[PDB]
Amino acid sequence: PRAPRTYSKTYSTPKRPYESSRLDAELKLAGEFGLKNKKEIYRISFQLSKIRRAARDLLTRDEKDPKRLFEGNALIRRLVRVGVLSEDKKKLDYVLALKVEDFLERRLQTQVYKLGLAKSVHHARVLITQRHIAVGKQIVNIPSFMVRLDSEKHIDFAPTSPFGGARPGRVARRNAARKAEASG
Amino acid sequence: SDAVTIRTRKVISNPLLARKQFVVDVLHPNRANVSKDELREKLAEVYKAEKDAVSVFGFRTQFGGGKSVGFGLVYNSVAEAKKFEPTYRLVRYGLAEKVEKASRQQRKQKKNRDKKIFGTGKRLAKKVARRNAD
Amino acid sequence: GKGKPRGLNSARKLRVHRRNNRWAENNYKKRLLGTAFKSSPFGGSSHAKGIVLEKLGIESKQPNSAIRKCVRVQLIKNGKKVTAFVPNDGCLNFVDENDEVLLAGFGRKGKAKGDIPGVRFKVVKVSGVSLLALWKEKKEKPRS
Amino acid sequence: HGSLARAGKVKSQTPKVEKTEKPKKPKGRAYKRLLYTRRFVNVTLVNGKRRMNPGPS
RNA sequence: GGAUAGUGGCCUACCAUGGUUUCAACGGGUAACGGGGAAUAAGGGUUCGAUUCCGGAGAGGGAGCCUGAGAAACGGCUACCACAUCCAAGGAAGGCAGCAGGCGCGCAAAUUACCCAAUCCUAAUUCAGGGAGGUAGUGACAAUAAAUAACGAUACAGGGCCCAUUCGGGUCUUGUAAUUGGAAUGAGUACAAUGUAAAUACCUUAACGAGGAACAAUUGGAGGGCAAGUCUGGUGCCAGCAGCC
C-alpha cells in the first residue's frame, strides 16, 4: 500500500477536569481574547509545553555543546520571529519562561483588534472568518494565523472584499438595486 | 484579457523532448479563473511559437482568488508536440480524436471468452450450428 | 539487608523472584491465565447479544428497597445464562420476553454495581433500539 | 406489598409539563462571551460567594 | 559411500557410547508469526505490535511432482480426506487468507463502481496488459483548521471620572430588550472556469441564498469526590437514582 501519512495531536486536556482556578483562568482568557472553545487554550498550552520541554532538555546539556548551541539558536530565533520572545534577549531563560497569554496576544485574531481593524476582538473573529482580511496580498480566514512581525505592517483588509473597496457586498448590492428602483 | 499578465518561471529548455517546460502563473484580479484555451493562446502569442504547440495543465488557484499557478509546456513544432504529448492531453486540446472502446469489464469479459475459444473458431462455430440443426 | 539480593550477578534471582511474586496481582493473573476467554460470561468482550427468558424481580441490598424485574438472558455465542439490569424508570416494558438484547458491563470490571446483588450486566438495546431512545421517546421498537 | 409490578409508576404519575418556549441561546464563541460578561464584568450579584445559580429569595 | 547445486546423520553400512540439563534441558500452554515500531512514561518501567516497511509461512487439510534459472507453485498437475457444482446418469469439472460482492459468525468492519492519467511491473517490449496501483462511492477508526452571528436609539442592571448654580448635565462608555436599524458572510443551490482519461470534491467566481415561530448544538450533570439549585410540582424505602459514599 501507499506510505502512511503521519498525523499528530495538537492539544492536551487538563489532568483535573474541574479545578475552579483553572476554569476561571481559562474562561478569562477565552473572554478577553475571543476564543470559541477551551481547545484553543489547550492547544497553545500544548505547544508552550513542547517548546519548554525542548528548552529544558537543552539546558541540561553542558555549555559549548554543539547540540545545545545550535538548538538554542534555532528555538530562540523561531520564537523571536513569531514574536513571543523578546527582540533583545537570547538568554533562553525567557524560553523557559514564555506564557500562554503571550502566545494568545501574538495570534492574529487579536492582531486585527490591536492594529485597529476590529473595534472588538469578536468583530475581529467574524472579520477573519468572513475573510475580510489579508495578511499580505493573500487573504486569510484563520483566526490563529500567528503572525511574525513581518506581516504586522502588512495586515489590512482584503481588496477582493468590502472595507477594502471595489466590492459593494452581498446586501449592499441588494440595497443599491433598491435605491435604483426608488430613484427611477 | 485585462491585466491577465500570464508569466513564466523556472524555464528549462530540453531538446530531449524538443520543448521547454516552465511554471506559468497568471495574476488575474477581478477574474474567477482564466480557462486553459485562453491561457494557451496567450502563451502562444507571447512566445511567438504556435497556438497548438503550447500546453497548460495544473493551474491551482491561490486561496481567496487573484492568482493561479500551473505547469506550462511549449514545443518546438506541432509535429513534435503531437509525438511527445500524452493522448489524454491531446484529446483535451482537441488536436486528437479519442478512441472509442467499451467498458473495461466488457473488454476483459471479451478477452476471457476469446481465450476460452481456441484458434479462429469459425469451423467450430459452423460445426456447432450444423450439429444443432441436424 | 533488605531481603532481595544485591549481587551484581543476581539478576536471574531478581527476575525469577519478580515473576513468581507477580502472580499475587489480580489483573496480571487474570490476563496471563486467560480467565476472560475461558470463564467470563462475555468471553472477554465489552458487549454481548442475548435472548430474554423470564422475569427476575431482584430485591435490593441494604438499606434499600426496589423489586420489579431484571432480565434473565441466554447469550448467543455462549449459551450462558446471565442476569442483566434494565437501566431506567419504567424501561421494563420494552424488554418483555423472547427479545434480543445487547448487554454491557455495569462498570465494576465484573462486579455487581450497587444495591443490586448478583447482577453484573445491564441492557443497552432491545432488538436493535437503544433503551435510552425508547425511554426518551425518540424511537419505538419494531414489532412489525 | 408485592412491588414486582408497577414499573414506571412515577414516570406515569408525573404531570406532563411542556417546556416553556424561550429565545435561542448563543452557540460557541458567543456562549463563551456570554459567560465572560456574566461571570467577570457583571457586578449584579458577587457579594457573598459569586454563586452561579441563585435561588429566588 | 549414496544423494545434493553444494557442506552436514541429509541417508545408508560398520564402530564407539555418546549429546542436553536446576546457568531450567525435556514436556505443556499461548485467545504467539518475529522485528522496525505503538500507547503511556521525572528517572527506572508497564502494556501492545493481525495491520502501510523488512523477513517468514500459507492458498480447505496433508502428500507427491512436471515445467522451469528460480516453485515442492496452487488464478500448475496428480492422489487421499472434508466440502461442494452441472447432467440426458454415461461422465465432467472446483478451490476468493486477490478485487468487489453473498452467507455464516458475531460487540465488531465499505461499492458486485471508473481508469492504466500517476508509482511501478511484465512481455518479442516506447505501442499491450496489470482489481499491483490510482480515482471515486460508503465511512463520526482516529487526526487538522474551524459556521452557529458581529456593530447601533431608547425602556433597565451599575466596575472607573468633572461645578459648592447640594436627586441639575453627563465631554470618555460594560451587559438582555418584549417600542428596533441604510451592515457581513458562509452552509446550500449554479449554465461557468479549473481539477480530473471525462465529472460530482477543493481552491476561484455569475446570479440566488439570514432576523430571531426561523439556516434553531448537542451530550452529560447540578450532595461530596467534582463548580454547577436546601427553586417549584409529583411520588412517598414505591418508582427510581447512585462508578464509591
Q: Dump the DSSP string for C6-55.
A: --TT-HHHHHHHHHHHGGGSHHHHHHHHTHHHHHSTTTT-SEEEEEEEEE
Is any Cβ of chain C less than 8 angstroms from the Cβ of D9? yes
- How many Å apart are D34 CA and E175 C1'? 9
Beta strands C81-85 and B54-61, pairing class: unpaired
C66 touches strand E (CB under 7 A): yes
CB pair distance less than 8 Å for D5 and C68: yes
- φ/ψ of residue A54, rounded to 5: -60, -45
Judged by CB atoms within 8 Å, which residues 151-180 of A form the interface with B?
A: 158-160, 166
- How many Å apart are A38 CA and E46 C1'? 32
Here the cell at position C93 is: 416494558
Alpha helices (runs of H) in chain A, residue ranges in sequence order: 20-33, 39-59, 66-82, 93-96, 100-106, 108-115, 121-129, 170-183
- φ/ψ of residue C55, rounded to 5: -115, 115
**Residue in chain A nearest D28 by alpha carbon:** A36
D6 touches strand E (CB under 7 A): yes
Is A45:A100 a contact under the CB 8 Å cutoff? yes
Q: Do chains B and C touch (3 or more CB pairs under 8 A)?
A: no
Is C50:C75 a contact under the CB 8 Å cutoff? yes
What is the distance of C-alpha C44 from the center of its chain? 10
Q: Is B24 exposed, middle or buried (0-12, 13-18, 19+ CB in 10 A)?
A: buried
Q: Which helix (H) or strand (E) holds B115?
A: helix B104-116
Q: Strand pairing partners for B26?
A: B6, B68
Q: How far is the alpha carbon of C141 from chain D, nearest alpha carbon, in Å?
A: 18
Q: Which helix (H) or strand (E) holds B113?
A: helix B104-116
Which long-range contacts does A70-79 make (Cβ < 8 Å, 24+ apart)? A75/A51, A79/A51
Contacts for D36 with CB less than 8 Å, ≥ 6 apart: A27, A28, A30, A31, A32
Percentages helix, strand, coil for chain B (3-state, rounded to 5) are: 40, 25, 35
Judged by CB atoms within 8 Å, which residues 11-50 of D form the interface with C?
A: 11-12
Is A138:B64 a contact under the CB 8 Å cutoff? yes
Radius of gyration from C-alpha coordinates of chain A: 21
> How many Cα neighbours within 13 Å face the side chain of C138?
6
Judged by CB atoms within 8 Å, which residues 81-140 of A form the interface with B?
A: 131, 134, 137-140
Contacts for B113 with CB less than 8 Å, ≥ 6 apart: none
Backbone CA torsion sign across C42, C48, C53, C57: positive
CB pair distance less than 8 Å for B65 and A160: yes
Q: Strand pairing partners for C132?
A: none
Nucleotides of chain E in contact with protein CB (under 7 A) are 23, 30-31, 47-48, 52-53, 105-108, 113-118, 129-131, 133-134, 142-151, 157-159, 174-175, 177, 182-186, 192-198, 203-205, 208-209, 211-214, 216-217, 220, 222, 226-231, 233-235, 237-245
- What is the residue type of B60? R
C-alpha closest to that of A58 among A92, A82, A81, A87: A92
CA dist list (Å): C9 to A8, B42, C13, C20: 43, 83, 9, 19
What is the distance of C-alpha A61 from the center of its chain? 31
Is C128:C111 a contact under the CB 8 Å cutoff? no
Q: In whole angstroms, what is the distance from residue A140 CA to residue A109 CA?
A: 11
| Resolution of the entry in angstroms | 2.7
Q: How far is the alpha carbon of A1 from chain D, nearest alpha carbon, in Å?
A: 41
C-alpha closest to that of C120 among C90, C75, C64: C75
Would you give the DSSP letter of residue B132?
Answer: H
Domain range annotation of chain C: 1-144
- φ/ψ of residue B125, rounded to 5: -65, -40
Give chain B's domain count.
1
Q: Which of D33, D38, D51 is the best residue to mutate to test the A interface, defined by the most A CB atoms within 10 Å of its own CB?
A: D33
C-alpha closest to that of A100 among A64, A46, A144: A46
Is A115:A11 a contact under the CB 8 Å cutoff? no
Domain range annotation of chain A: 17-184
Backbone CA torsion sign across A140, A86, A66, A62: negative
- How many Å apart are B66 CA and E151 C1'? 30
Q: In whole angstroms, what is the distance from residue A13 CA to residue B85 CA?
A: 55
Is B26:B34 a contact under the CB 8 Å cutoff? yes
Q: Which nucleotide is nearest to A178 (CA to C1')?
A: E182
Is any Cβ of chain D less than 8 angstroms from the Cβ of C57? yes
- How many Å apart are D18 CA and E176 C1'? 24
Q: Which domain, by its residues, includes B114? A: 1-134
A153 touches strand E (CB under 7 A): no
